[PDB]
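User: Hi! Is it possible to get a structure for several chains at once, not just one? Here's what I have:
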Amino acid sequence: SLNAIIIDDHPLAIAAIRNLLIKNDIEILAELTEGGSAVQRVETLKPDIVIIDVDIPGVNGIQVLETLRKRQYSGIIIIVSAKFYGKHCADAGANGFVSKKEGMNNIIAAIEAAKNGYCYFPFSLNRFV
Amino acid sequence: SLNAIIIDDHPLAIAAIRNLLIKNDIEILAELTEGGSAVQRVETLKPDIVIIDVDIPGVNGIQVLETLRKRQYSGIIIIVSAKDHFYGKHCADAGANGFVSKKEGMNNIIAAIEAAKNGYCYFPFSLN
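Assistant: Yes, the chains can be modeled jointly so their relative placement is included. Here is the combined structure:
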C-alpha cells in the first residue's frame, strides 16, 4: 500500500480525506494541522503522498510544497482548497490541485493520475475560447 | 451517452481507442485518418470529445486543436501520441484538456476524459 500524510486543519475535510484514503488502500502515516512541522515530518516518515490544504496555519501550504521540492522530495503532492490558483501550484511542482467543494472523488483521481505519471489541475476554457 | 470523434491514422490504436470508448458508454460519431477535414467534421457533428493523434497526416494535429479553439469549440480535446516527456506543455498552452502517451495503454485516455468531465486537465508530470 502507498503511504500518505494529511496536512489540513479543517475537521470535516480531515475525516473525509482519511476515510477516502483508507477505502482506497492508502495508509496514513501522520495527520498534521499546521505547516511548521510538515517538512520535517515528511522527511522523517517518508510518505509516498502528501495532501496539503492551501489554508494550513503556520508555514503556508504552498511554501511547504516549495520547500519539499527544493529539498528533493520526489513523492506525490496534491494541494487541496475549500473552494485560478491551480496554475501557481503547478508551477511550484505539485502533482495536482483539487477543490474540496466538488467532493472526494477528485482527490483520489488526482492521486491516480499522479501514480500514472500525470498531473491533475483545474481547466479553464476561457483562457482559450 | 457522451459522443466522440477519433482522429488517428494508426490501425491498431484506432481499434483500441474505439473499444475503450464503447466500453465506457461513449458513442463514436466519426473516425478520421487525416487532419484536412477535421475542423469541418467537428463543427458539423458536434462531438463532446475529440481525440487527436499528434502524427495525423494533412493539417497537423496540434494545429487542428488550435483552430478548433479559435473557432470556439468548447468540448473535450485529448491529444495522444504513440511515443516522450515533452509535448504536453505545448498541448496545454494550445488549450487541450489533456495529452496522453498511448504506449502505457488505454487507461490514461479514459482517465483524461474523466478528468476533463470533472473540470480538470490531465498532462504528463516531470519532477525534472
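The CA atoms of residues 97 and 119 of chain B lie 9 Å apart. DSSP finds five helices and six strands in chain B.

User: Great, thank you!
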